[PDB]
Ligand binder design. Structure first.
Ligand SMILES: [Ca+2]
Ligand SMILES: [Ca+2]
Length: 279
């Protein structure tokens, strides 16, 4: 399949080179996989989700995404026009309030919730969780992300927008999950992206167009936007049978575009998520 005039990030993850405009992908598109978006919620009624999104848990008064961030990230995972894995099922877990903020204890609860809830869902191609969130280092946040990964979920987490070493941020610094830095359309590390030895991979993160609340769309930037490219890619590759939840991060690093990024500090991987799609 080919989506013409796709958002630059979708085009980038299906090209060895920057500057293309078509997103090339296998039509299986993540069908049969499930991605939990642990965030501000998902506006599941957005036409871009085609019925494939639903809220499954909220830690606040409503399950409505009053913010947009979670709807944006969910759209990069799996919306029709803006998503990597256009046929995945999306499950929203609202751990962040409508200002985009959330307590670590609630974030941890949402991770534990996903580890259990997946056992009640039919996700034959496997389960991913996208965590476009984070704050300062917390061993209990890292342990919760480690547990979620150990339970059989491919966990992708933002590296953080601090232009600093991700070792000081969580869940970014948990080694066992997939920590995702951000790049821009010219293959530079995004100016805000964290870096460091714990990063596993970069994905498109600057000026990413996706779904927003109110049935709308908008373009925002962050490691939050790069993370769902990787989560969506994992779901896509799991549906293809090329990898598993336990091995998807390593597989994505294995198969990434290597050495294409600029302003990568020595000791940070120079790896950009790539679907290796060949028609
Ligand atoms: Ca290249
Ligand atoms: Ca890792």
């Amino acid at each position: 399949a080919a989506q013409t005039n796709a958002p630059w990030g979708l085009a980038r993850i299906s090209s060895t080179s920057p500057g293309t405009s078509t997103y090339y992908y296998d039509e299986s598109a993540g069908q049969g996989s499930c991605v939990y978006v642990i965030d501000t919620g998902i506006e599941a009624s957005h036409p871009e989700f085609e019925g494939r999104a639903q809220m499954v848990k909220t830690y606040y008064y409503s399950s409505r995404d009053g913010n947009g961030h979670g709807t944006h990230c969910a759209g990069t995972v799996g919306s029709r026009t803006y998503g990597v894995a256009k046929k995945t099922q999306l499950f929203g877990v609202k751990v962040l309030d409508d200002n985009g903020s959330g307590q670590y204890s609630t974030i941890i609860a949402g991770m534990d919730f996903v580890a259990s809830d997946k056992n009640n869902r039919n996700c034959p191609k496997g389960v991913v969780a996208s965590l476009s969130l984070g704050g300062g280092y917390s061993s209990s946040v890292n342990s919760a992300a480690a547990r979620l990964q150990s339970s059989g979920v491919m966990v992708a987490v933002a590296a953080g927008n601090n232009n600093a070493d991700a070792r000081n941020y969580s869940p970014a610094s948990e080694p066992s999950v997939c920590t995702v830095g951000a790049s821009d359309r010219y293959d530079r590390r995004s100016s805000f992206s964290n870096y460091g030895s714990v990063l596993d991979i970069f994905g498109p993160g600057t000026d990413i167009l996706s779904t927003w609340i109110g049935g709308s769309t908008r373009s925002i930037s962050g490691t939050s936007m790069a993370t769902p490219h990787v989560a969506g890619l994992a779901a896509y590759l799991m549906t293809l049978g090329k990898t598993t939840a336990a091995s998807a991060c390593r597989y994505i690093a294995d198969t990434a575009n290597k050495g294409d990024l600029s302003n990568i500090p020595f000791g940070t991987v120079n790896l950009l998520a790539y679907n290796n799609y060949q028609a």
